[PDB]
Amino acid sequence: DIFNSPQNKASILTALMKSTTGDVEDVLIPKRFRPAKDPLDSPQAAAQFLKDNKYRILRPRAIPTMVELETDAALPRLRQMVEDGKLKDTVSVPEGTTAFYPKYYPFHKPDHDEVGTFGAPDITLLKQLTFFLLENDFPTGPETLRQVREAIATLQYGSGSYSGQLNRLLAMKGVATGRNPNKTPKTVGYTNEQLAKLLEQTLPINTPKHEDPDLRWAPSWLINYTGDLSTDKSYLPHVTIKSSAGLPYIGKTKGDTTAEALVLADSFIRDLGRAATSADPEAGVKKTITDFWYLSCGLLFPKGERYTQVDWDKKTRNIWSAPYPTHLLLSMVSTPVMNESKLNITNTQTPSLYGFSPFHGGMDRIMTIIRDSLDNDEDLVMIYADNIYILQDNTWYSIDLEKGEANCTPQHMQAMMYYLLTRGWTNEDGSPRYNPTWATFAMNVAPSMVVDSSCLLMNLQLKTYGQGSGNAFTFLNNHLMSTIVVAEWVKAGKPNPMTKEFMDLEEKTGINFKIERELKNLRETIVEAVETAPQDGYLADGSDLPPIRPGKAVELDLLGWSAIYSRQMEMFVPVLENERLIASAAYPKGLENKALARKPGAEIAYQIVRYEAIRLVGGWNNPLLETAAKHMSLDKRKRLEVKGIDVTGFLDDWNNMSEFGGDLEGITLSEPLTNQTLVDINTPLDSFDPKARPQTPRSPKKTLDEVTTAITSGTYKDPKSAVWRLLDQRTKLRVSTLRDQALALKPASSSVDNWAEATEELAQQQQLLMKANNLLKSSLTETREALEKT
Ligand SMILES: [K+]
């Protein structure tokens, strides 16, 4: 026995403990990340950490124990549903004689003790990329491989840690109260009417459909159930059935608690309305607020993201999981308006990017606007929640509010409520599409329920600094804050984003922000993108292959998208920003959709979806990534065909299972991705003429620049409409005045004969009584005080 293939001889100690200590490291494959043990994973350690860092911990409040009530007694409008056996005959409500302190313990995965399939990097793809690189002469191949391996080695998809969540809360407090403490719109210098005039341009809205119910009813009254499928309708917002119910139902989904949410939402709105018109509105309103304190406390859910391994315990984004009744009531105000307001820069003369999709010509419409602005030597601004985009001095600037939500004051949300109730919930005659009860909830209570309220982590009831990220108004409040920053930029004579004059806008507004991207020589970059467009492959000559040499991309990072010029379509098309593309390839999310995960059909289809989606979003233009992902999806498809396993239904309706499912609803993945798929996703319904875009619904002819100029002159301090004047006065008057405020609104709300004249007289009357400083107190402060009572 001579020349036998060597086998590793090791000590019995090594053998016993299965040690790889001696073994040669395969630098081609990164080791799995194992999160450290978390020292802040106990209520004692977490509370001490927060105390040491001067973070406010509230005196804990208790929720009454659950009591069973008859569904038909609690929800009389749904008696028929109970009778038809379609709805449970009992509801579990917090009306007990005893009470409990709520506890929320979220799961953080992976963790020190569990490094499993959740958050696993795509090592199979890494191996496929490696092998395809050996077999193919792709000039961009080595860089693609390096990038995917580096993302696997440095990032981690998962739900962070308690330390990450706690450190994140500190960062939010610092944004809100630290270097640049928050400022209410009034402190900055804006009245609710002045802000509404800016929002008419930055966030154009339409009124809800005339057939949509006004804000006059208890939520359950918007449910019409008879049994007749043709007439059965809910006029309420839609909900994510598998999402958390929030307080007072920890561990339950919205699906398990819809009847309970309706009972609680009905009760809160009913009690509030009665209290407001009672003999003592202050005592009654404060009692209702205290009784339903839990409707203002969000479960501090750790957000799943592709975090950096080194900053695993330094930063974990949180989702402020709003109580289902609060969510329902807030959504009743925002959704009917927003559903009718998908107005953005591609379809309306507005800087708004609300409802934007880069697909179906969207990216090309943006590129046309960018090119025209560059040609006409004009500045350009675009706004999307906490994202600001500025085109000035042949440069594309991406400005993001620093931890956006943390900059929010209840007054910012109150101004948004004013905008929605004046511009949205209004009839053609100027009369309100709401009653005093709804104006009370919307204007006086709602902003202090989700802004500067509280959250729950473990058994700790913690202060929330700013607005709760994930609440129904997150986008709207963030968009209003960006509007203030942009308005201040215009006022300051449009200082370049790289200057101190631009950075000084942080103090002027009390809103923290940072320049995230500076894309220099824009005009030249766009020219290069067109010139370098390949003649070969997908969207070039139409063949089902990636280009040998991909063209230059205009790296706008416009809501995560870059632009590529297509010779076949003679237009710019979106491709997911490189860094996001690589991170999604390295750390794919799993089947993260309800019970869907238990459906073998969905689980199986997902494995194909996962690779098809990575190709669709931009992988198609990365020769190595397209080659490997195509191979993998085809292999999976072939196994199914050979085995006779049908998942076509899940492949057709794939959108629900992919982080990329948005907008791409009309595309099907039952057939493999081809050049047609790419043509289809990029096909516009209509040709584009920027000059043909309709102007904003309100103040059409006016631009944001014109409105800013008017505001600096002291214009729009007060609305002309008496109905609107009453709503602005509502923001200044203390809760004890609610019964009298209800009387001032009743004529316009009831649309009585001569309501307009009556309202004018009542508004002037109210205006006079507001000369008494004793009557002047923010109901938002009164709400917070009542919510925090023990
Ligand atoms: K701030």
Author numbering: 3 to 792
List passages from the publication reporting this PDB structure.
Members of the family Birnaviridae possess bi-segmented double-stranded RNA (dsRNA) genomes and form virions with non-enveloped single-shelled icosahedral capsids. From sequence analysis it was proposed that the RdRPs of Birnaviridae possess a non-canonical active site where the polymerase sequence motifs are re-ordered C-A-B, motif C containing ADN in place of the conserved GDD catalytic residues. An additional unusual feature of birnavirus RdRPs is their ability to self-guanylylate: auto-catalyzing the covalent addition of a GMP moiety to a serine residue of the polymerase in a template-independent manner to form VP1pG. We have cloned, expressed and solved the structure of the RdRP VP1 from IPNV in both its apo form and bound to a catalytic metal (magnesium).
Clear electron density connects the helix with residue 31 of an adjacent molecule in the crystal in 7 of the 8 molecules present in the asymmetric unit. In addition, residues 3–10 are seen in this structure extending toward the catalytic active site. As in the high-resolution structures, the helix formed by residues 13–19 lies in a hydrophobic pocket within the active site cleft formed by loops of the fingers domain and the N-terminal extension. Residues 11–12 form a short isolated β strand which interacts with residue 241 of the fingers domain, while residue 10 spans the two sides of the active site cleft. Residues 7–10 interact with a loop between residues 594–598 of the thumb, this loop being partly mobile and modeled as having two conformations in the refined structure. Residues 3–6 interact with the thumb, the palm and the C-terminal extension, the side chain of F5 being buried in a hydrophobic pocket between the side chains of residues W563, L578, R582 and F662. The observed self-interaction brings the N-terminal residue of VP1 (S2, assuming removal of the initiator methionine) within approximately 5 Å of the catalytic site, and removal of the N-terminal tail or mutation of S2 to alanine abolishes the ability of VP1 to form covalent RNA∶polymerase complexes. Instead, we propose that residue S2 at the N-terminus of VP1 represents the site of covalent attachment of RNA product to the polymerase.
